[PDB]
Design a protein around this ligand. Structure first.
Ligand SMILES: [Mg+2]
Ligand SMILES: [Mg+2]
Ligand SMILES: [Mg+2]
Ligand SMILES: [Mg+2]
Ligand SMILES: [Mg+2]
Ligand SMILES: [Mg+2]
Ligand SMILES: [Mg+2]
Ligand SMILES: [Mg+2]
Ligand SMILES: [Mg+2]
Ligand SMILES: [Mg+2]
Ligand SMILES: [Mg+2]
Ligand SMILES: [Mg+2]
Ligand SMILES: [Mg+2]
Ligand SMILES: [Mg+2]
Ligand SMILES: [Mg+2]
Ligand SMILES: [Mg+2]
Ligand SMILES: [Mg+2]
Ligand SMILES: [Mg+2]
Ligand SMILES: [Mg+2]
Ligand SMILES: [Mg+2]
Ligand SMILES: [Mg+2]
Ligand SMILES: [Mg+2]
Ligand SMILES: [Mg+2]
Ligand SMILES: [Mg+2]
Ligand SMILES: [Mg+2]
Ligand SMILES: [Mg+2]
Ligand SMILES: [Mg+2]
Ligand SMILES: [Mg+2]
Ligand SMILES: [Mg+2]
Ligand SMILES: [Mg+2]
Ligand SMILES: [Mg+2]
Ligand SMILES: [Mg+2]
Ligand SMILES: [Mg+2]
Ligand SMILES: [Mg+2]
Ligand SMILES: [Mg+2]
Ligand SMILES: [Mg+2]
Ligand SMILES: [Mg+2]
Ligand SMILES: [Mg+2]
Ligand SMILES: [Mg+2]
Ligand SMILES: [Mg+2]
Ligand SMILES: [Mg+2]
Lengths: 244, 98, 95, 240, 122, 75
RNA sequence: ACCAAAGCUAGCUCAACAUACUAAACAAAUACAAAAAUACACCAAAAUAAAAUAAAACAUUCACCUAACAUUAAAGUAUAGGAGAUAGAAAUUUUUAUCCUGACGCUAUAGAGAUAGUACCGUAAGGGAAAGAUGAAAGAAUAAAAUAAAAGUAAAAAAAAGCAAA
RNA sequence: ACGAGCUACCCAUGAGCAGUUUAAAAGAACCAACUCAUCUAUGUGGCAAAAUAGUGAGAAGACUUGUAGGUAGAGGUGAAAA
RNA sequence: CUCGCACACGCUUACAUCAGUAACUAAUAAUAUACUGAUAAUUAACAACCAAUAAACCAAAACAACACUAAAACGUUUAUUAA
RNA sequence: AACUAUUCCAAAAGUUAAACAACUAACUUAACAUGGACUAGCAAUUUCGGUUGGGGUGACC
């Protein structure tokens, strides 16, 4: 016999039933759409169409991402959207030579970075690509607000972002307690990214953490039947009092 | 960062279908190592006067080692960004005044 | 030869044929002679000519090539400017 | 699976402590070192290898200890001596002629006049004469003794340059150290340990030594008599 | 080939294997190694005087059964709290804040036998 | 509580009374209520197996009706 | 005349539909040596599938091979390949509802392994059976009723000479 | 994936070795228990998928042995007999 | 004619009493510790379960006087709390 | 190939002169540790052409 719905859709229809239904819509819409991550290891060709060199004919051409592995320790730092390339290689690059398994590993560095909005120095493992992206986006906090989830690739990056996004939507006074000058000054330049509060606490969440959170907002000790029966009784007694 | 390219051409799937991959599409040739490129420079705007490099309110080009690990942590410089640039446009206009 | 393909279940063509032979529509196959670019200084001009020819294959070879080649290659082709369009019909054949 | 090492006891005791041999196996259980196992059962005596160790941090000065008894040790080739002063006892490695009912000085104090060296004496290197025999030699000051502990071994103090001592290890290699490091003066106990004759294979087994393999290996290029110029001098002196 | 299927029991193992049959522990091991019983952990049977009362283990056959109505939270609310509540709302003395006079209990942790975590066996 | 055990079954876990709170408890801490990823495969199998059984129970009942209808055609 | 022989049921197979997809049953006990109410902790984790095989050997290669996108064509075409074996697209095209669900599928050596993952066999992972037939009634057993047909025997040992018959 | 309850080697923790000879508990000697397995005959679908009868070697040691643990197949372990 | 009584480990009712055995177990019988049924049964003093943290203790077991070398398993007491 | 050690270039952190002559370079390296090479160890994959008055040796193709 057959499953009525394809198994590929069993993950999706898992999210249409049960507690996942009661999750905030903006969050589910942030998980739904998977935007193609910025090319990192493979280098993309710009054109859609390319003239075949051998053939002399106009050829349709597509860009296929190269699978990259992210060890879990990459989720503790920020590696700049990159990771391990697991693959094979020919020796000497002659197609006729041996074919050999090969893995290319990113070069990692211990670097401490300063977050303005979070007023803190974090000791983080980053790549040279991360530093170039921070450089290019002109600030640490900039790089973290200005980059999509798929491009950071870190749970830690997403938690940093959740944090300073909250600090922006709240206008948290505890940022710089003594100097409202510094405070307004900093909260000023980042005014482009400011989002409401209901959105800001759901940004960097894994589906697990989300389901937990929603389970805790929904936590209620079932109401004693004495209450409900008392209210039914007061309803009936007030309708017996108002009819005469 | 290693930049890598496929030895075997991948067929097309054009409608938005995901490409159908074989094991032979896992064989890569190494086209570049970014770390081995001749390295670029970093452009900054100094907020104080550095010994060798220059004055407060100056536009300087250094090597990224010196800029990342000395100047920017110590608040001796800021990035070349436009919003940070207009500040020193104004500073240059109100300096030469008095 | 693949008689039933994996994806389509159709019958594949052996491309190694399609590069060295030519099928007229009559069923005759046409081929180059072997070794015609090889060691020319060492050969007679007569032999060289015999080599520069385009020649026809015997029945057995023809049937073999037809089996190794799908239907598409046996279709009637009208090419503009085609050298060989002159030769694709057969004439005055009493058998 | 996983085994825990027996080597956990935090507080120092003169009392013999019980220990578990493991023939050549690492903590995973695989054989790392071949040919070890099943000796006689042994207790272990904790040895204090820092010879200058002021009892209380209150009185820092050079102190003196009495040698109570000199005992055999199963764990090391040298013979060891029980040494008591103040309220405290410790096991130290015994110098050659050290005997029971004895007096032994432990001092960190250098001086311009050096010192007349007895046996049990522990002094900083800079405080000794330049021909002296030393054992239990520290590397970095405050570290504790590592070098020249084996039975009947002695190194020699060679010279003193630039607030630094240069000594000669029993392998006849030279070692450069600060002159602030402590050493004991003399040859280590039990000098005839060299000439001991193991009579029978059984005796070897008593020492926890399992026989060599039976496999026949042809000798390689590594084999022969290699005559190498003696190695350069090790310096534990960290230059600025 | 041993025995897989037959259930594991104290009769089966070595000397060192002692596994109770499921009676409940009445105490702890004390100082001397001797065992100490805690008078509180030993169930105290509460038995009424049966002698002066008339009921029997069986019932007369011609005695009727009845229409079977399972007790519901509602019926119990109507036999107890409803007369008192109606009496004090009709009199205007009803206080939605404190219902405790009607027998409602806000929290269970004060009283001896609690209903929800269920402090008593039977 | 409704929990998911090692085997991926959705189980009703009754609670137990302890003198110490749950994070300080060795023995309880070494139970796992959650499944690892491999378990997901087995879960699927379970479903399918179940589905089969139901599927051919249904077909049986259907069959039994037809037989009877040609044995007792009083309709 | 013995040994035997015959049933037609148990259920199964393949699809359709379908809601949606870990059944049933939970009082206690169950992750101490599972089924043992009760004491200060720890807890947890990921790395490319490989090869048999095809190439008449074997070394690059070798569809499918536990990753949703179907259907009609384009097309076994463009391309890719020790340019060998083989592999192989796309642009672009086509697809009209819902009911009429069943059977030129099996019938106890078949159909599920299944009366059962049981017995039994393995230390363990694991392997894994066989077996049913009276009648409306057996609350009709001095019991009544239709095959007596396999090999094996009995009823009934053998009598010169020979592929055993012609 | 599963296997070191057999066997190889280890780790913990226990247990055995009587008589005789010797200044001696000396990998000495005689000889039991104990441990092995020399030589022959039985046996060869056997009592037994390696035994029986005799006969032999060691027998305070590199000895035998119980219990609980360890090392795992690209491995382990090995007084090498693959 | 002489491998006996007990315990550990392991087996799990194969043990006990009464009855039955045409056939089933015993490599045959007789009958029964082993097949069948019914009914019972091993009772704790033995055994398992049965404290932590500090602190003084260098000093073998060998009839232990005292030693040998291969350097050796096995606890007292004092303090602090121990339902 | 991987892995284990070696050696080197690059990456990464640095450091010096304001360099020399007349009228930018050079050097540094604690533990980790990346990319690309080198030399070994330990290894991985695969194969033993045919004819032959049997095969082998010899001979031959
Ligand atoms: Mg030792
Ligand atoms: Mg010694
Ligand atoms: Mg040797
Ligand atoms: Mg040898
Ligand atoms: Mg079994
Ligand atoms: Mg027991
Ligand atoms: Mg027992
Ligand atoms: Mg008692
Ligand atoms: Mg092949
Ligand atoms: Mg073949
Ligand atoms: Mg082959
Ligand atoms: Mg394959
Ligand atoms: Mg090519
Ligand atoms: Mg070929
Ligand atoms: Mg298409
Ligand atoms: Mg069947
Ligand atoms: Mg079957
Ligand atoms: Mg017959
Ligand atoms: Mg005849
Ligand atoms: Mg064992
Ligand atoms: Mg004796
Ligand atoms: Mg002897
Ligand atoms: Mg014998
Ligand atoms: Mg005889
Ligand atoms: Mg004998
Ligand atoms: Mg003898
Ligand atoms: Mg002898
Ligand atoms: Mg074990
Ligand atoms: Mg192999
Ligand atoms: Mg091996
Ligand atoms: Mg050999
Ligand atoms: Mg049995
Ligand atoms: Mg009986
Ligand atoms: Mg019998
Ligand atoms: Mg090889
Ligand atoms: Mg291969
Ligand atoms: Mg040959
Ligand atoms: Mg041949
Ligand atoms: Mg010949
Ligand atoms: Mg011949
Ligand atoms: Mg030859």
């Amino acid at each position: 016999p057959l499953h009525k719905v394809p198994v590929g859709l069993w993950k999706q229809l898992r999210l249409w039933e049960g507690i996942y239904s009661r999750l905030p819509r903006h969050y589910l819409r942030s998980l739904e759409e998977a935007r193609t991550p910025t090319p990192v290891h493979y280098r993309p060709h710009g054109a859609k169409f390319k003239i075949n060199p051998k053939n002399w004919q106009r050829e349709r051409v597509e860009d296929v991402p190269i699978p990259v592995h992210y060890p879990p320790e990459s989720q503790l730092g920020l590696w700049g959207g990159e990771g391990w390339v697991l693959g094979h290689r020919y020796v000497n690059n002659d197609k006729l030579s041996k074919r050999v398994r090969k893995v290319w590993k990113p070069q990692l560095f211990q670097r401490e970075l300063y977050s303005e909005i979070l007023d803190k120095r974090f000791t983080v493992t980053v790549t040279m690509r991360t530093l170039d992206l921070i450089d290019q986006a002109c600030g640490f906090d900039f790089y973290i607000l200005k980059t999509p989830k798929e491009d950071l690739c870190s749970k830690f990056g997403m938690d940093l972002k959740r944090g300073m996004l909250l600090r922006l939507a709240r206008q948290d006074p505890q940022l710089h307690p003594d100097d409202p000058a510094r405070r307004a000054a900093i909260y000023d330049r980042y005014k482009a990214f400011v989002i409401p509060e209901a959105e800001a606490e759901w940004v960097g969440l894994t589906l697990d953490e989300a389901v937990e959170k929603q389970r805790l907002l929904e936590e209620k000790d079932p109401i004693p039947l004495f209450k409900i029966f008392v209210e039914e009784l007061l309803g009936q007694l007030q309708q017996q009092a108002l009819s005469e | 960062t290693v930049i890598v390219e496929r030895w075997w051409k991948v067929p097309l799937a054009g409608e938005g279908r995901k490409p159908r991959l074989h094991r032979r599409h896992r064989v890569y040739k190494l086209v570049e190592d970014t770390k081995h490129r001749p390295k670029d420079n970093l452009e900054l705007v100094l907020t104080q006067s550095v010994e060798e490099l220059g004055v407060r309110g100056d536009l300087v080009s250094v090597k990224k080692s010196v800029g990342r690990n000395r100047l920017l942590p110590q608040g001796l410089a800021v990035y070349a960004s436009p919003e940070n640039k207009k500040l020193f446009e104004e500073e240059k206009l109100l300096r030469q005044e008095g | 030869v693949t008689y039933f393909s994996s994806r389509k279940g159709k019958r594949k063509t052996v491309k190694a044929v399609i590069y060295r032979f030519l099928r007229l529509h009559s069923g005759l196959w046409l081929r180059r002679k072997a070794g015609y670019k090889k060691k020319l200084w060492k050969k007679t001009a007569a032999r060289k000519r015999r080599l520069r020819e385009f020649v026809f294959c015997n029945k057995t070879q023809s049937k073999l090539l037809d089996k190794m080649t799908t239907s598409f290659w046996k279709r009637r082709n009208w090419y503009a400017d085609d050298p060989y369009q002159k030769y694709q019909d057969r004439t005055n054949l009493k058998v | 699976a996983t085994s825990v090492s027996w080597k956990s006891r935090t507080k120092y005791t003169v009392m013999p402590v019980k220990m578990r041999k493991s023939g050549g196996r690492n903590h995973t259980g695989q054989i790392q070192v071949h040919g070890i196992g099943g000796g006689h059962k042994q207790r272990y005596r904790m040895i204090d290898f820092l010879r200058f160790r002021p009892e209380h941090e209150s009185k820092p000065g050079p102190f003196e200890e009495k040698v109570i008894a000199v005992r055999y040790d199963p764990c090391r080739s040298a013979d060891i001596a029980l040494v008591a002063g103040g309220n405290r006892k410790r096991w130290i490695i015994a110098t050659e002629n050290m005997k029971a009912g004895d007096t032994v000085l432990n001092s960190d104090h250098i001086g311009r006049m050096a010192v007349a060296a007895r046996e049990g004496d522990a002094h900083p290197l800079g405080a000794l004469p330049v021909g002296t025999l030393i054992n239990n030699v520290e590397s970095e000051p405050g570290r504790g003794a590592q070098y020249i502990r084996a039975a009947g071994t002695c190194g020699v103090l060679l010279r003193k340059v630039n607030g630094t001592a240069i000594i000669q290890l029993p392998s006849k290699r030279q070692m450069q150290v600060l002159e602030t490091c402590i050493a004991t003066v003399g040859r280590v106990s039990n000098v005839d340990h060299n000439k001991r004759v193991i009579g029978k294979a059984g005796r070897n087994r008593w020492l926890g030594k399992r026989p060599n393999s039976g496999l026949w290996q042809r000798k390689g290029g590594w084999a022969g008599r290699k005559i190498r110029p003696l190695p350069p001098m090790k310096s534990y002196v960290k230059l600025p | 080939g041993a025995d897989r299927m037959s259930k594991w029991t104290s009769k089966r193992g070595p000397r060192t294997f002692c596994k109770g049959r499921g009676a409940k522990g009445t105490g702890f091991h004390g100082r001397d190694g001797k065992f100490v019983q805690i008078k509180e952990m030993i169930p105290e049977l509460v038995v009424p005087e049966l002698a002066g009362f008339k009921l029997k283990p069986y019932v007369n056959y011609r005695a009727p059964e009845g229409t079977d109505t399972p007790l519901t939270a509602k019926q119990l609310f109507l036999e107890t709290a409803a007369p008192a509540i109606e009496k004090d709302f009709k009199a205007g003395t009803f206080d939605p804040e404190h219902l405790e006079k009607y027998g409602f209990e806000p929290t269970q942790e004060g009283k001896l036998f609690q209903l929800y975590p269920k402090n008593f066996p039977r | 509580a409704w929990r998911r055990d090692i085997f991926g079954r959705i189980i009703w876990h009754k609670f137990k009374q302890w003198p110490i709170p749950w994070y300080l408890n060795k023995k309880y801490n070494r139970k796992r209520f959650f499944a690892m990823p491999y378990v997901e495969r087995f879960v699927r199998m379970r479903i399918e197996k179940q589905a089969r059984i139901k599927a051919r129970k249904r077909s049986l009942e259907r069959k039994k009706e037809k037989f009877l209808q040609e044995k007792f055609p009083h309709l």
